[PDB]
Design an enzyme around this catalytic site. Structure first.
Site, PDB file in Angstrom:
ATOM      1  N   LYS B  63       0.828  -1.200   0.000  1.00 58.10           N
ATOM      2  CA  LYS B  63       0.000   0.000   0.000  1.00 58.10           C
ATOM      3  C   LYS B  63       0.866   1.256   0.000  1.00 58.10           C
ATOM      4  CE  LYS B  63      -3.214  -1.059   3.424  1.00 58.10           C
ATOM      5  NZ  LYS B  63      -4.444  -0.612   4.210  1.00 58.10           N
ATOM      6  N   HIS B 105       1.939  -7.294  18.073  1.00 59.51           N
ATOM      7  CA  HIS B 105       0.877  -8.284  18.079  1.00 59.51           C
ATOM      8  C   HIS B 105       0.373  -8.506  19.497  1.00 59.51           C
ATOM      9  CE1 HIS B 105       4.479 -10.768  18.952  1.00 59.51           C
ATOM     10  NE2 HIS B 105       3.635 -11.406  19.743  1.00 59.51           N
TER      11      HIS B 105
END
Ligand SMILES: *P(=O)(O)OCC(C)(C)[C@@H](O)C(=O)NCCC(=O)NCCS
Lengths: 77, 119
Positions: B63, B105
């Site tokens: 992206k 995470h």
């Protein structure tokens, strides 16, 4: 062809709905297929049909409706 | 030097785990040989998170790179290996400029961010 039915069945599993009567829906814009699903699509095509699609041959803009995906798969076969 | 692109990604670990549990060859598709060698040494819970984080990071990178994963940049064009201290660096990628990557995470999620700069 069994190929088109198999492509549409893979898509139905991935998106959660039957897209055979909706062959021009933009799967990504409507949120029923995403990135991850598009990778699983490639893995399923290879696993179920023996059609490996290298990522170099995959452009979201050219694989973003069921009709386009069936056309892309039909040819490679 | 200016920003060329940015990309972030938030990935559900259970979606990755489901693909892995189905026996599909997701690791071979997404990971480079070096990344795959690291993945192979890990126990399952760590394999899920590592796999998710790499998928996530390479989506985020694509992206920033401007195109999404595809003909312009594929998973095999991007490599991300931890330092000996455990710090991830973009060791291989197509963009001619600095690439910045950060990953974090929980037990259920992974989040990655990429920025690309052009000099
Ligand atoms: P991919 O970006 O097609 O996958 C989408 C995702 C569910 C895996 C998610 O983690 C993500 O990156 N979503 C970005 C799409 C979005 O947020 N659109 C709202 C702006 S149109």
């Amino acid at each position: 062809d069994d190929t088109k039915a198999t492509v549409l069945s893979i898509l139905a599993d991935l998106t959660g709905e039957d897209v055979s009567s909706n062959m021009d829906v933009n799967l990504f814009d409507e949120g029923i297929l995403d990135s991850m699903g598009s990778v699983q699509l490639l893995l399923e095509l290879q696993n179920q049909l023996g059609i490996e699609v290298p990522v170099s041959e995959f452009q979201r803009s050219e694989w973003d409706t069921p009709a386009k995906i069936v056309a892309k798969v039909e040819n490679l076969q | 030097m200016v920003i060329y692109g940015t990309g972030i990604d938030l990935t559900e670990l259970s979606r990755i785990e489901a693909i892995l549990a189905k026996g599909l060859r997701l690791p071979e598709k997404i990971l480079t040989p070096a990344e795959l060698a690291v993945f192979s040494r890990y126990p399952v819970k760590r394999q899920i998170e590592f796999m998710a984080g790499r998928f996530s990071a390479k989506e985020a990178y694509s992206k920033a790179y401007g195109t999404g994963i595809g003909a312009a940049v594929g998973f095999q064009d991007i490599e991300i290996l931890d330092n000996a201290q455990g710090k991830p660096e973009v060791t291989r990628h197509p963009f001619d400029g600095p690439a910045w990557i950060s990953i974090s995470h929980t037990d259920t999620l992974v989040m990655t961010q990429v920025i690309l700069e052009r000099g």
